[PDB]
Amino acid sequence: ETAIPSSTRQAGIIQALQNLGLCHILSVYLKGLDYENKDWCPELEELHYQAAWRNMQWDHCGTSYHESLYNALQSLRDREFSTFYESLKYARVKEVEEMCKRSLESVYSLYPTLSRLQAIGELESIGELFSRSVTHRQLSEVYIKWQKHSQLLKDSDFSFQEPIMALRTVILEILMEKEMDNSQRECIKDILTKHLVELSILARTFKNTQLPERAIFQIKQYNSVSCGVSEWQLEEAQVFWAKKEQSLALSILKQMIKKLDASCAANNPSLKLTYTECLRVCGNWLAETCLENPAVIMQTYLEKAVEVAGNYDGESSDELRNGKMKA
Amino acid sequence: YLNNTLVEDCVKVRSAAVTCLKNILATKTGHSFWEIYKMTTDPMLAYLQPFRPFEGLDDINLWIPLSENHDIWIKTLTCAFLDSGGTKCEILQLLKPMCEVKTDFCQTVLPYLIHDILLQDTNESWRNLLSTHVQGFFTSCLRHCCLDKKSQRTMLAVVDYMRRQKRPSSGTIFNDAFWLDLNYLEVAKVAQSCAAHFTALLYAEIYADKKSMDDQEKRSTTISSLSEKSKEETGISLQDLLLEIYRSIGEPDSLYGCGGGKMLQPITRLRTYEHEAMWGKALVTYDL
Ligand SMILES: [Zn+2]
């Protein structure tokens, strides 16, 4: 449709491309718009800055919220904090004044402003953490606080949570980029993988399959496969299942089971619980699709998972009892 | 073929052709051919009535001097094969004057002279040398070297002709297809590069059968195991070649057998998306 004015048609196209998981295509389309159109309106310029900071396009060079966020990210990448803090303060002031100038009267309008201020606060916390040094305990406490707050955001809409997850992913990528080779790098990589899988479930619960696929792609880019498959293989299998690719997900999960049951050796209780979860998921998938009679699949998967969970329940941890109850 | 090439405008080719007619037609083989051929009702009788060693072959540069010199390459191959003592038949020895000026004759008689030489081979003396030279030629072609398609298509025609030759010893068609000690994966990839999908698939099946037989005799084996073994030893994955053959051939349901819909590699996913016309997810996959 070309009858829609270009003032909002371009914004709608860019938003649809963002929600479709297309980043490089969006960047090239925006470059084409820059080539064909010289002047930039505030809305399209704000979308340009949003795409620049979201896609880590550092090559591209009052200010909008996305412009301030991109400037703060660039300053953080350059080990500059004064301009970073000033930009965050200016963004906070601009957002507050813009929010309070209108007539309000609607709760739903507060959600975007709250999400933007939460993103600014998270960036402030990251800057405070990265001001002088990074330690394992600080990263662990930051991650557990983020997970707790995300639990407080379970009932929130995905539209108000997607920018938060994107900013967290960008922050973790920046920390990975500027981390010296040590065990701290491994800890940050594990935290990044856990954040990506949490984002994968978060987007899967909202009928979205492109963002989980991008998260799995990033995990594959950073993490590497080995003899012992981690939980991100199971997350990839679930994502492929959500994409109506039942055969591929079943094959991947069967390969995971074949790898786990032959080289388990009780190496880690986390491996045991993820094996139980994989067995339960495979049993549920076979029950739903009915590719085999229940008699063999039940004994192969469900009872195996039950006995695996029950044979090593000496710790009585929550992460084990919840899995046992689910099985 | 001599009669067909006798009626061209060029004079050197027809002079060479008539000299060949006078040469072969004057031998006992020509007399026997006339005796057998007199019974048929063919005007060719009226047309032809008035007309009644290893040291020179081992050279890496001789086999692949292919820099816009395909004609020179086939000509020098034919000359080096005819001047050696491998050739025995008079008709397979006196063709030198005419094949030197005709390009297509070299291509159409190279398999014939190869078969004639291998017929008289003893203790596989010529067999091993020819197999090694042909394998080296195929490896040179597979190099990243930018050779013109005429050489590969001529070699494919030669291999196809040799596959149909009956082995003098007792054997089956499987032994017939192995006239030379070769692995057919490289030849299959070459045929794929020449859009010869059927021959490439047949050669891939032959190579898989050979590998299975070798494993069975070694012991006295899924598609993934064969693909990884080929990647480790040869350097070319058989599964990808089979998928490409099954896609480019246009067969409705053939890519799924090689791993379609069950392979984690992005390439197979893209091929399945294109095949199933799932363009919406395909674009996301290419961008991602
Ligand atoms: Zn080349």
Concise structural overview:
Chain A has 327 residues and is mainly α. Chain A has 15 helices and no strands. The longest helix of chain A is centred in the middle third of the chain and has 22 residues, at 183-204.
Greatest interface and its participating residue counts = A-B, 16 and 10 residues
Strand elements of chain A, count:
0
Globally, the shape of chain A reads: globular
Structural class of chain A: mainly alpha
Radius of gyration of chain A: 23 Å
- Percent strand of chain A: under 5%
Task: Provide the helix percentage of chain A.
Answer: over 70%
Q: Report how far the terminal alpha carbons of chain A are from each other.
A: 50 Å
Regarding quaternary structure, how should these chains be classified? part of a larger assembly
Secondary-structure element string of chain A:
HHHHHHHHHHHHHHH
Bound molecules: zinc ion
Number of helices of chain A: 15
Query: How would you characterize the largest beta sheet of chain A?
Result: none
Subcellular location (chain A): Nucleus; Cytoplasmic vesicle; Cytoplasm, Cytoskeleton, Microtubule organizing center, Centrosome; Peroxisome matrix
Organism (chain A): Homo sapiens
Protein name (chain A): Serine-protein kinase ATM
Family (chain A): Belongs to the PI3/PI4-kinase family. ATM subfamily.
